Curated annotation (Swiss-Prot):
Organism: Homo sapiens
Location(s) in or outside the cell: Nucleus; Cytoplasm; Cell membrane; Cytoplasm, Cytoskeleton, Microtubule organizing center, Centrosome
Residue positions, PTM ADP-ribosylcysteine: 320
InterPro entries in UniProt: Gprotein_alpha_I, Gprotein_alpha_su, GproteinA_insert, P-loop_NTPase
Keyword annotations: ADP-ribosylation, Cell cycle, Cell division, Cell membrane, Cytoplasm, Cytoskeleton, Disease variant, Epilepsy, GTP-binding, Host-virus interaction, Hydrolase, Intellectual disability, Lipoprotein, Magnesium, Membrane, Metal-binding, Mitosis, Myristate, Nucleotide-binding, Nucleus, Palmitate, Transducer, Transport
GO molecular function, one term: adenylate cyclase regulator activity
PROSITE patterns in alphabetical order: G_ALPHA
Lineage: Eukaryota, Metazoa, Chordata, Craniata, Vertebrata
UniProt-recorded name of the protein: Guanine nucleotide-binding protein G(i) subunit alpha-1
Chain positions recorded as Mg(2+) binding sites: 16, 150
Binding site for GTP: 12-17, 120, 144-150, 169-173, 238-241, 295
Span of domain G-alpha: 1-323
Length: 323
């Protein structure tokens, strides 16, 4: 059953968006006794999260959207003490709900790139109701969401077609890329997200650099890698949706000057999928398994995922292939 997809890709590839999608389309958890032990940890980190989003409202000027949000915030420090016990009185529950919903607290979390946020601070508050329920048991995902920053590798469990997946997000930015070896073990198939819109955008790592050309480079290092020969490679041209818009104005020539093709979503987006697959040293014996995708659209990540899963079955099985 264990697939364990890896999420590789250039920065801003949208790999993070793919992670949240699994929470929606899929829902699984099977370790109820183990989860109860964690229950203190879940309620704990959640209070630590919104408190971050709150104090950031000070150091960055940000008023609460509604005047009413005053007093609810002050209360949070009081009821929060019970949350350390792993208990959640409903009064603690709604008080948090009013804050995260706020038009102004949302002003902070968009800003979150500056102040440190808890790793899970979104995933928890977004589902704050389900955790609130009496004698709540953490989902098997909830346990993984636990802990202070350190591992640098987000975990995400979900069971599709009765097989347990373990997606492992890793930051696209070059600083994060060195971390990637930790996830290499036990992988079934890689998804290599790549933003088609990047064709004009420059990396934050280097404004001179073309973001797309950067994707072509590290992608070669992975697909060619001897370690991955056993593992399926599956390209994921992310953000096909916004790309059809931006192409209408900007020429593709901003990335591949040689290009002649029309400003159409087909000739344009498809042209990249040509240049990428060409990198393969082993076209004779290795299939790229490309798939256009739109992480922002849950409807599109879903039907596509159904196809990719089938390839994992017929191809991958039993202790990383051999026996």
């Amino acid at each position: 059953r264990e697939v364990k997809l890896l999420l590789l890709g250039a920065g801003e590839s949208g790999k993070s968006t793919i992670v949240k999608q699994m929470k929606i389309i899929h829902e699984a958890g099977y370790s109820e006794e183990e989860c109860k032990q964690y229950k203190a940890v879940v309620y704990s980190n959640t209070i630590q999260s919104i408190i971050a989003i709150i104090r950031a409202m000070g150091r960055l000027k940000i008023d609460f959207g509604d005047s009413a949000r005053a007093d609810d915030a002050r209360q949070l420090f009081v009821l929060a003490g019970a949350a350390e016990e792993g208990f959640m009185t409903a009064e603690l529950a709604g008080v948090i709900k009013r804050l995260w919903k706020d038009s102004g607290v949302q002003a902070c979390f968009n800003r979150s790139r500056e102040y440190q946020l808890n790793d899970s601070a979104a995933y928890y508050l977004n589902d704050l109701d389900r955790i609130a329920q009496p004698n709540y048991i953490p989902t098997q995902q909830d346990v993984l969401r636990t802990r202070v920053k350190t591992t640098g590798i987000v975990e995400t469990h979900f069971t599709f077609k009765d097989l347990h997946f373990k997606m492992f997000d890793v930051g696209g930015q070059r600083s994060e890329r060195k971390k990637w070896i930790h996830c290499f073990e036990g992988v079934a198939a890689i998804i290599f997200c790549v933003a088609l819109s990047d064709y004009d955008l420059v990396l934050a790592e280097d404004e001179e650099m073309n973001r797309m050309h950067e994707s072509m480079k590290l992608f070669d290092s992975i697909c060619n890698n001897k370690w991955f020969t056993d593992t399926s490679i599956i390209l994921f041209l992310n953000k096909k949706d916004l790309f059809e818009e931006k192409i209408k104005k900007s020429p593709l020539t901003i990335c591949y000057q040689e290009y002649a093709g029309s400003n159409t979503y087909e000739e344009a987006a498809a042209y990249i999928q040509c240049q990428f697959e060409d990198l393969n040293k082993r076209k004779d014996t290795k299939e790229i398994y490309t798939h256009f995708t739109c992480a922002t659209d849950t409807k599109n990540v879903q039907f596509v995922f159904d196809a990719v899963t089938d390839v994992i079955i017929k191809n991958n099985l039993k202790d990383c292939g051999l026996f």
